[PDB]
Design an enzyme around this catalytic site. Structure first.
Site, short mmCIF file in Angstrom:
data_model
loop_
_atom_site.label_atom_id
_atom_site.label_comp_id
_atom_site.label_asym_id
_atom_site.label_seq_id
_atom_site.Cartn_x
_atom_site.Cartn_y
_atom_site.Cartn_z
CB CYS A 275 -5.00 -1.00 5.55
SG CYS A 275 -5.89 -0.01 6.75
CD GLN B 77 -1.36 0.00 3.67
OE1 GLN B 77 -1.89 -1.10 3.90
NE2 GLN B 77 -1.65 1.10 4.36
CG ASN C 122 -0.68 -6.69 6.24
OD1 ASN C 122 -1.45 -5.75 6.00
ND2 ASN C 122 0.24 -6.63 7.20
CG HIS D 201 -3.84 -2.90 9.39
ND1 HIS D 201 -3.44 -1.93 8.54
CD2 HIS D 201 -3.25 -4.09 8.93
CE1 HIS D 201 -2.67 -2.48 7.57
NE2 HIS D 201 -2.55 -3.79 7.81
C1 LIG Z 1 -4.84 1.38 7.07
N1 LIG Z 1 -3.79 1.57 6.31
C2 LIG Z 1 -5.26 2.29 8.14
N2 LIG Z 1 -6.35 1.75 8.87
C3 LIG Z 1 -7.69 1.99 8.69
O1 LIG Z 1 -8.18 2.76 7.84
C4 LIG Z 1 -8.62 1.17 9.61
C5 LIG Z 1 -9.50 0.24 8.75
C6 LIG Z 1 -10.78 0.08 9.56
S1 LIG Z 1 -10.66 -1.20 10.71
O2 LIG Z 1 -10.58 -2.40 9.94
O3 LIG Z 1 -9.63 -0.93 11.62
C7 LIG Z 1 -12.18 -1.19 11.49
C8 LIG Z 1 -12.20 -0.81 12.82
C9 LIG Z 1 -13.38 -0.78 13.54
C10 LIG Z 1 -14.58 -1.13 12.95
C11 LIG Z 1 -14.61 -1.53 11.62
C12 LIG Z 1 -13.40 -1.56 10.94
CL1 LIG Z 1 -13.51 -2.04 9.34
C13 LIG Z 1 -10.91 1.45 10.21
N3 LIG Z 1 -9.56 1.94 10.39
C14 LIG Z 1 -9.15 2.80 11.38
O4 LIG Z 1 -7.94 2.94 11.60
C15 LIG Z 1 -10.18 3.54 12.18
C16 LIG Z 1 -11.08 4.34 11.32
C17 LIG Z 1 -10.50 5.06 10.27
C18 LIG Z 1 -11.30 5.81 9.42
C19 LIG Z 1 -12.67 5.84 9.57
C20 LIG Z 1 -13.46 6.68 8.58
F1 LIG Z 1 -14.15 7.67 9.13
F2 LIG Z 1 -14.37 5.99 7.88
F3 LIG Z 1 -12.73 7.28 7.60
C21 LIG Z 1 -13.28 5.12 10.59
C22 LIG Z 1 -12.48 4.36 11.46
C23 LIG Z 1 -9.79 3.95 13.57
C24 LIG Z 1 -10.74 2.80 13.37
C25 LIG Z 1 -4.20 3.11 8.86
C26 LIG Z 1 -5.14 3.79 7.92
#
Ligand SMILES: *C(=N)C1(NC(=O)[C@@H]2C[C@@H](S(=O)(=O)c3ccccc3Cl)CN2C(=O)C2(c3ccc(C(F)(F)F)cc3)CC2)CC1
Length: 220
Positions: free
Chosen positions: A25, A19, A187, A163
């Protein structure tokens, strides 16, 4: 259910990507799940555009290279009526203007299923559906520098997942330890990371790293 599953052997899974410096991710998790379900539907495996998701799914709540949710990506594909191929809309690891082209759409979805928040339900989904998008806590040095074997981090959180990754199977590895059961996880940190880009994560150890807390797949 089966004692072990590996959807890679059955043609459901595209290569591992890196990525880069973009927090995408979630886009790679989402395309992985959709790649699997499109393959189930049609028998054709086509690499989908993460860039299309990064650039275009803000209205569904995603935040490009600052993160997003797989279910928001599935919602975009449904709302949008499609998603382009990687070939037609290649990855740049940045946020750019949406250039979705409907003629080059190669996938669709009709919504998504959120799996009940227990490792037994996740196993049975993995056994039958195909690859599954999941959230994990990847925020530990032990994960950054994972090389091989079954990953167990005593400081992992079942709630602070940060993640998105893809469960492509599970199994029981005979190590003669309390750490035999695993989820097989794809991953998006390149093939050089872990075991060809994959990690075996502790299974049935009290929802380790939150792997069953936000599991889902698109319907097609
Ligand atoms: C990936 N390179 C990286 N991580 C993320 O964007 C992660 C992906 C999801 S999650 O899988 O961790 C998750 C967590 C909780 C419930 C459902 C899911 Cl799918 C979210 N996330 C986050 O880091 C997170 C987050 C980020 C963005 C949003 C948005 F508003 F929609 F944009 C919500 C939540 C903190 C949870 C490092 C960037």
């Amino acid at each position: 259910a089966p004692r072990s599953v590996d959807w890679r052997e059955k043609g459901y899974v595209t290569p591992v990507k890196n990525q880069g410096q973009c927090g995408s991710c979630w886009a790679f998790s989402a395309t992985g799940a959709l790649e699997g379900q499109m393959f189930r539907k049609t028998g054709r495996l086509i690499s989908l555009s993460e860039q299309n998701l990064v650039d275009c799914s803000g209205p569904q709540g995603n935040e490009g290279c600052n993160g997003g949710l797989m279910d928001y990506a599935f919602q975009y594909v449904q709302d949008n009526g499609g998603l382009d191929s990687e070939e037609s809309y290649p990855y740049e690891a940045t946020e750019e203007s949406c250039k979705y082209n409907p003629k080059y759409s190669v996938a669709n979805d009709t919504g998504f299923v959120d799996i009940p928040k227990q490792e037994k339900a996740l196993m049975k989904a993995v056994a039958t559906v195909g690859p599954i998008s999941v959230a994990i806590d990847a925020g530990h040095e032990s994960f950054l520098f994972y090389k091989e074997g079954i990953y167990f981090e005593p400081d992992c959180s079942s709630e602070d997942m940060d993640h998105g990754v893809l469960v492509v199977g599970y199994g029981f590895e005979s190590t003669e330890s309390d750490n035999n059961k695993y989820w097989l996880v794809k991953n998006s940190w390149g093939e050089e990371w872990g075991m060809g880009g994959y990690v075996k994560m502790a299974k049935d150890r009290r929802n380790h790293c939150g792997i069953a807390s936000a599991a889902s797949y698109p319907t097609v």
